[PDB]
Symmetry: C3
Subunit: 149 residues, 3 copies
Amino acid sequence: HVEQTYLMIKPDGIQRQVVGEIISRFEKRGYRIAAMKLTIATPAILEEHYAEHKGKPFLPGLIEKMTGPVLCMVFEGVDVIAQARKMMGSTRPGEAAPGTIRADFCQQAGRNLIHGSDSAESAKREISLWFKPEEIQSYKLALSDYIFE
Amino acid sequence: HVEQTYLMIKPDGIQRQVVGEIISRFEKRGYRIAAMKLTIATPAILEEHYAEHKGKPFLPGLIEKMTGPVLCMVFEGVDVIAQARKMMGSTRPGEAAPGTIRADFCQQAGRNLIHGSDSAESAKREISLWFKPEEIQSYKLALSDYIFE
Amino acid sequence: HVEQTYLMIKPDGIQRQVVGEIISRFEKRGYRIAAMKLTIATPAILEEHYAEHKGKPFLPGLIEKMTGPVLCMVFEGVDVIAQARKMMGSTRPGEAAPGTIRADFCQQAGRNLIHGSDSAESAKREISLWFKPEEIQSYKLALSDYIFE
């Protein structure tokens, strides 16, 4: 049993030019790239993505910081939703564990490089929001026998 | 005082071609390569290596997965038995700490890339099982004065 | 709001030729190099640096190990004093968390590669001890908008 999570490199990850390093961290565990698309996030789609924060005073500045290039991604693996969150580390980089993305690259929550789905429900919703179902690609990793039990 | 531990790259480490990266992690701490040998593990030697699991229901599958190329290694350093176990991380990669080998490279316990002795007694027994005494090399690291107190 | 910390690569970091790797770990978080100087540390400066240990039995040996080439550094960032200490890891490398400098590079406390200020007061004192005010360089990182909230 594998699952799929939605991961998104935020504009700071694009502008700091660490896209390849981020992708490599997930590839290193044998997670499969099931979907990938560069876009520019706009306020209308960001309001849907951040629907949980509608009306909160921090939302407008959050949307402004997220208005820019982003890399939309779907990765597949065992327990990948929870594992990707663990690899990202805490929202606040100063609290994130050493060896996580946020601790290794970042200083503050307002520029923390990457978004990842926090639950199966959020992964389904976020994948649907940012990708058409057709953009999710089906193929098998050739090294599967040495990654999976 | 230094000690020696037995570390073995499992067939998944060979096949995923991460042998050099694994070795580099141990060299990075100034641990000394005291022995190294590529072999193909066979059931008879694996039964001895995993003697603690004799009769357990999971053993036949464990031996099958380990039947393949392995890199046998002995590393020397301060507290290296326990330290190497700490660097490997938990047997389940999903539980292993970020920055450990298992967390950085793997998904499931059945393909967790590397074995390391769990005690002084296991290290002595395992080194003797996989190496002859003539294969253990004694030399001094040139940077010893900057590694050891 | 940023602050500045004093970080010093000890003679073992110089001799093991890992200066660049150490610097890269701090640059990776968008910390700014505010000052940098290679020197050979003298007992006179080291006695003041380690003034908190005056009269203790271990101080003479501590000074002797530090009498050699060192790289004096000042880094600037959010919470950088505590964050740099977290990135360095525990004094004893065997107790340091995976992914910290000491855990990744070192074996024993007497050769633990790097010093960092432990508080706001000690950072201010140490920066002033090792650098003249004219050696502290004020400039803004071009990627500031993508690093800071």
